[PDB]
């Protein structure tokens, strides 16, 4: 599981 990026 990864950290949510600043854009979709």
């Amino acid at each position, epitope marked *: 599981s*990864t*950290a949510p990026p*600043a*854009h*979709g």
Partner: antibody, heavy 116, light 110 residues
Framework: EVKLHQSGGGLVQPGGFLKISCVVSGIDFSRYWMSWVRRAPGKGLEWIGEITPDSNTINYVPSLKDNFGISRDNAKNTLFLQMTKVRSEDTALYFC?????????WGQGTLVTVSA | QAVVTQESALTTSPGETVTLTCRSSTGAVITSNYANWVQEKPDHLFTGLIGRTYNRVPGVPARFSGSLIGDKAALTITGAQTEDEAIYFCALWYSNHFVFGGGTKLTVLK
């Protein structure tokens, strides 16, 4: 305690090259998208690019893709920025950042001065 | 080559509400521009506030909120504090890169 520790930079001649590093501790570096931005007087903040955890997406602002290169080594928790053919207008403070919903963690900055 | 435009400067007073806006040269700001807001305090102390228009960065106080207002993205600060005197940059996403606006100098009258 999360630390984005930058090193490198300094003085470069016009047309020269430099590689900057950002070593990440306190978070699981292999989970994070990473980004490079630069700050210069009168030039606000400029986003240079970003890189996914697996390096298979590397995005750049189009004007900078020719002479900037972003890479990472997850085994050494390190993000890199390479610059080639630099010009005086590339003088700036360069910052690494990691994404968590937004620009969540920030390095301390690396000064690159381009002057002959 | 898109240009992102912000107010040059805004003045508010402690405890008041201030809204900063972010405009795109391409048309109305939409959710696929994933508006981000970053605060620059002195000594180049950067703090991410908002990503993807609405989402607070973990640990950011509730008095910072993101929205769309008309054709623009917006950052609202409620109960403004003198510590909030800073430069605020917005960034918009254009398919495969971010572009930062020119920043807004926020005064919270000391």
């Amino acid at each position: 305690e999360v630390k984005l520790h930058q090193s490198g930079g300094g003085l470069v001649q016009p047309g020269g090259f430099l590689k900057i590093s950002c070593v990440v501790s306190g978070i699981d570096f292999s989970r994070y998208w990473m980004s490079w931005v630069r700050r210069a007087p009168g030039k606000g903040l400029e986003w240079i690019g970003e890189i996914t955890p697996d390096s298979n997406t590397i995005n750049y602002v189009p004007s900078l893709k020719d002479n900037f290169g972003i890479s990472r080594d997850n085994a050494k928790n390190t993000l890199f920025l390479q610059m080639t053919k630099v010009r005086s207008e590339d003088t700036a403070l360069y910052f690494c950042a990691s994404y968590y919903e937004g620009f969540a963690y920030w390095g301390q900055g690396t000064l690159v001065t381009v002057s002959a | 080559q898109a240009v992102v435009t912000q107010e040059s400067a805004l003045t508010t007073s402690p405890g008041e509400t201030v809204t900063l806006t972010c405009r795109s040269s391409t048309g109305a700001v939409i959710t696929s521009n994933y508006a981000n807001w970053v605060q620059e305090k002195p000594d180049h102390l950067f703090t991410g506030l908002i990503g993807r228009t609405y989402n607070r960065v973990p640990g950011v106080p509730a008095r910072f909120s993101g929205s769309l207002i008309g054709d623009k993205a917006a950052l609202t600060i409620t109960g403004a504090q003198t510590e909030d005197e800073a430069i605020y940059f917005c960034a918009l996403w254009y398919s495969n890169h971010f572009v930062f606006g020119g920043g807004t100098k926020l005064t919270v009258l000391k």
